[PDB]
């Protein structure tokens, strides 16, 4: 169901098998480099159930450039692209050994996606920095042009991240808001009292 949907939850503990399959997964994890996940908690995320054929977008910084590649492969993806976001101010000027002018987003593929519009966009985003850790909205447009109309899921999103065609998971979202009947049905049997524990 087209309009934005979301689930406030601990992504470590949610049974994501209730959500079905997605053409695109995006994650902006709180890598251990407020609350973070240990390297083991990241490895153990049940990403493999979320897709059969499609793309994963994984934001990485620092040593998660390497840990993120490890998770990508462990979860069953091959890294096939790497987007960089060049961070500018409102006037298009770029904001340990080097100053950092960019953030990286790994692009992984699982299976054999068919019917995606590969090559419409290029792999550099130029866009203004906003609040701390706020990714640029351009990424949603690139993903929509890549795979228009399909179901997508964002991990570790915040309220400003909710978008049509997306289900957003994160622990600072406001409650549960589900509209897809297949998801509502599976959520109700799995969580009859609406509590997501253990």
């Amino acid at each position: 169901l087209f309009p934005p949907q979301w689930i406030c939850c601990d992504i470590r503990y949610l049974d994501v098998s209730i959500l079905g399959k997605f053409a695109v997964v995006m994650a902006d994890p709180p890598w251990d480099i407020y609350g973070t996940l240990t390297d083991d908690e990241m490895r153990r995320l049940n990403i493999p159930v979320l897709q059969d054929d499609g793309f994963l977008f994984l934001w990485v910084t620092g040593r998660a450039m390497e840990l993120g590649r490890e998770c990508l492969n462990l979860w069953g993806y091959e890294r096939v692209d790497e987007i960089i976001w060049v961070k500018t101010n409102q006037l298009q000027r770029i904001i340990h050994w080097l100053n950092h002018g960019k953030e990286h987003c790994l692009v992984g593929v699982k299976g054999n996606p068919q019917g995606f519009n590969q090559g419409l966009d290029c792999d550099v985003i130029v866009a203004e920095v906003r609040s701390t850790s706020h990714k640029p909205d351009e990424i949603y447009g690139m993903i929509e042009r890549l795979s228009p109309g399909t179901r997508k899921i964002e991990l570790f999103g915040r309220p400003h991240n909710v978008q049509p065609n997306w289900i957003t998971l994160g622990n600072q979202l406001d409650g549960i808001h589900l509209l897809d009947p297949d998801v509502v049905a599976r959520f109700k049997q799995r969580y009859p009292d609406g509590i997501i524990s253990k």
């Binding site: 590649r69 298009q92 080097l98 966009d121 290029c122 550099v124 351009e138």
Partner: protein, 241 residues
């Protein structure tokens, strides 16, 4: 303004719209120039060459293997990974590996770890197309290349922005040398797979297409013998006599 949408609409890459791309750096550039060794260079077929003949051990290695993706004798990541770079790197030393934009971003990291380095920066060469507005695995148009910085042992930004060079021009932006030299990492600097066109003061260049050589291991080592063994390349020369 969504420059991704704009690129879809017009073909102008988003990096075409980045603008403007203390001083003090001019003096530092001058100290670098004063301490630079004479350019040294050696024609060598690196696939058949025993790189251990390259002495002494280097403070900085710039590695630019000719990848097939650059053309649209080429080196595969199989070939590159089998170079024994660890055999010529100083115990404390740095590497800058041009990795391209495809599987090299992964295989180049395997190489760094194989040779004993850890990656500390990822330097992106972003190519504009102001003048002229696909890999089967690619999801997006590839408009950049990565140069990975590795360290072993105990003013610039990680971006280089220039226009995409003409077809068949495989040269990398000379700005990479500026970044490397501004780190003040030491004076024994090796550029593997360099060319006549990349020869530079302060560097030893080794590669298959060089037309001339002047490398002599004893002469080269004499540039770093005492009292000059530990200079950073960013300090005044030490008074002789």
């Amino acid at each position: 303004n969504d420059y991704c949408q704009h690129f879809v609409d017009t073909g102008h890459r988003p990096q075409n719209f980045i603008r403007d791309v203390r001083e003090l750096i001019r003096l530092k550039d001058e100290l670098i120039a004063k301490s630079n060794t004479p350019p040294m260079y050696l024609q060598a077929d690196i696939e058949a060459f025993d790189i251990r003949e390259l002495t002494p051990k280097f403070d900085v290695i710039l590695l630019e293997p000719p990848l097939e993706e650059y053309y649209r004798k080429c080196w595969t990541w199989d070939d590159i990974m089998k170079l024994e770079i660890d055999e010529i790197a100083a115990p404390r030393s740095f590497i800058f590996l041009w990795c391209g934009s495809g599987e090299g971003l992964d295989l180049g990291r395997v190489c760094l770890r194989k040779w004993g380095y850890r990656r500390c920066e990822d330097i992106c060469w972003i190519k504009t197309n102001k003048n002229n507005p696909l890999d089967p695995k690619a999801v997006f148009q590839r408009t950049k290349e990565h140069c990975l910085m590795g360290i072993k042992g105990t003013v610039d930004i990680d971006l280089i922005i220039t226009e995409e060079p003409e077809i068949g021009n495989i040269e990398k932006p000379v700005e990479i040398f500026h970044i490397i030299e501004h780190f003040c990492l030491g004076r024994r600097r090796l550029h593997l797979f360099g060319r006549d066109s990349t020869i530079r003061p302060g560097w030893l260049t080794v590669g298959p297409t060089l037309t001339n050589s002047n490398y002599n291991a004893e002469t080269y080592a004499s540039y770093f013998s005492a009292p000059n063994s530990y200079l950073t390349g960013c300090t005044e020369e030490i008074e002789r006599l």
